[PDB]
Amino acid sequence: AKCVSYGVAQIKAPALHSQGYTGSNVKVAILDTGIDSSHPDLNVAGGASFVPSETNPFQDNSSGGTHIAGTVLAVAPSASLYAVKVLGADGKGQASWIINGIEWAIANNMDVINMSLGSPSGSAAVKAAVDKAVASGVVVVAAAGNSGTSGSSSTVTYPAKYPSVIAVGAVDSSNQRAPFSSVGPELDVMAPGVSICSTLPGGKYGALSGTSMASPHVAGAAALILSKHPNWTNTQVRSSLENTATKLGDSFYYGKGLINVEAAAQ
């Protein structure tokens, strides 16, 4: 990664890089606004757009998908990225497009899906698609949501709220929960999500914040783990990440805590 970010070190990814693990032979689908494949620092192995008004997955008119792709590669420099456009330039998309992206990922043997997206209300059809991806063996990771808190209510967005999906909240560089990061019992783990520098469309770079930035740290961690343990199931990868996380406080706010990919990968 050309642009320096604290987040890679914070999740203990360099320990895996020192070991020789970089996420080789792991297919990671970025279900987002596209990936700017023309960026000199990003290689994209394949993809598909399901947004009828934005037909090219290898451009990104929003910036999030490109940034997220870069974070996956900062954590797992050898991962294979796939651009699955399910959100338009305004960052918004429909259930059915998301489903089509999940279905494509299953058909194309993805190992990991990242969904840095959410709705306050669930789709029963998206639930069916994410459940099927997990049953098929895919590690499904999602942003927990940027809906802050609501007293004792969960604010975890869908599909992160489903049991089958790993719900990733955001901490800052001090390991404090970001004010925006959604909360609730459905929260699994935390990762860095404040002022993360990564790739932006047009060969650019910059900092963004959100649970959208936290999720790809966990997707990249999954790729690192699979490169060390290519025989592990998605169940085992998920267990590793959750059971070895660094506890940070009450699970309503932090889940199991900050991922520690060095511990997760043994």
Partner: peptide, 4 residues
Amino acid sequence: YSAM
């Protein structure tokens, strides 16, 4: 659905 929105980007987070």
